[PDB]
Amino acid sequence: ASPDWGYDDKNGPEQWSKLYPIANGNNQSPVDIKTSETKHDTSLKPISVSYNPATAKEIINVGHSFHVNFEDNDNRSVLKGGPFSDSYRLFQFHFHWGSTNEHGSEHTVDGVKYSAELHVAHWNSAKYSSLAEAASKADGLAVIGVLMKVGEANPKLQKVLDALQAIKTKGKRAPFTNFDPSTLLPSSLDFWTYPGSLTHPPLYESVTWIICKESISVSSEQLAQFRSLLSNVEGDNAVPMQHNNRPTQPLKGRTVRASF
Ligand SMILES: CC(=O)/N=c1\sc(S(N)(=O)=O)nn1C
Ligand SMILES: [Zn+2]
């Protein structure tokens, strides 16, 4: 239980349950969003993101992916509105991609898989005292997912792509400062929401998902750069981060609410 899970045949998503029984839970993520079955909730408020760029701290290779971490000792960068009554503190953003540029997202819409997906995660600092605590509670986290569709290159990604040079292998880290992740969100913030979980181990069912209706672009060459990062530690044989997406999971009676 100290660790070893992956995205390969051997320790991949279809095997995770032998180690983490919650993989077969009732609130697993991601899911397929059937637009004809969502329900308009008039109580939903517009989402309000207020991030401080000086809160950007570092970028690190974690082997299965890379994370962009933020200082979360204060409420300098918060997520408000939507379905929530309390403020959520920003802590990180990361991406998910596939082995092909066409299909790599986690969530799907009407049975359609996007190229990639951006996740902006927050934790309930109004209720818990640390991310470690919140991480396992039902109302513990809030993640904004933004679907990515291959086409024209997205210049808003450049600073992230540039930083990838310094964290080529697992365990490498570098300072990553003065950046506001809201610059990556689509122009409209109409969304879908549903209760779910972390999409990789530990798979806790502690996330309130916010999926933006509108997608963002990325070219195939930008994606190729994600796919060029290595999962091995410095000095060993090269093993590229080919994919890190989980298949969609049974909805099991949950409701996907729409803000429109
Ligand atoms: C604590 C935490 O943020 N964990 C993560 S965030 C995450 S995700 N992909 O955003 O659902 N998956 N996991 C394992
Ligand atoms: Zn994620």
From Swiss-Prot:
Modification N-acetylalanine occurs at: 1
Location(s), subcellular: Cytoplasm
GO cellular component entries: cytoplasm; cytosol; extracellular exosome
Alpha-carbonic anhydrase domain residues: 3-260
Sites where the protein binds Zn(2+) 1: 94, 96, 119
Keyword entries, A-Z: Acetylation, Cytoplasm, Lyase, Metal-binding, Zinc
Binding site for Zn(2+) 2: 64, 67, 200
Notes on how activity is controlled: Activated by histamine, imidazole, L-adrenaline, L- and D-histidine, and L- and D-phenylalanine. Inhibited by coumarins, sulfonamide derivatives such as acetazolamide, benzenesulfonamide and derivatives (4-carboxyethylbenzene-sulfonamide, 4-carboxyethylbenzene-sulfonamide ethyl ester, 4-(acetyl-2-aminoethyl)benzene-sulfonamide, 4-aminoethylbenzene-sulfonamide), and 'prong inhibitors' BR15, BR17, BR22 and BR30. Activated by a short exposition to Foscarnet (phosphonoformate trisodium salt), but inhibited by a long one. Esterase activity weakly reduced by cyanamide.
Binding residues annotated for substrate, in chain numbering: 199-200
Broad class of where this protein is predominantly found: cytoplasm
Catalytic site positions: 64 (proton donor/acceptor)
Catalytic activity line of the entry: hydrogencarbonate + H(+) = CO2 + H2O; urea = cyanamide + H2O
Consequence of changing residue 67 to R: In variant Michigan-1; confers enhanced esterase activity and an additional zinc binding site
Disordered, as annotated region: 1-30, 240-260
Cofactor: Zn(2+)
Family: Belongs to the alpha-carbonic anhydrase family.
General function of this protein: Catalyzes the reversible hydration of carbon dioxide. Can hydrate cyanamide to urea.
Protein known as: Carbonic anhydrase 1
Source organism phylogeny: Eukaryota, Metazoa, Chordata, Craniata, Vertebrata
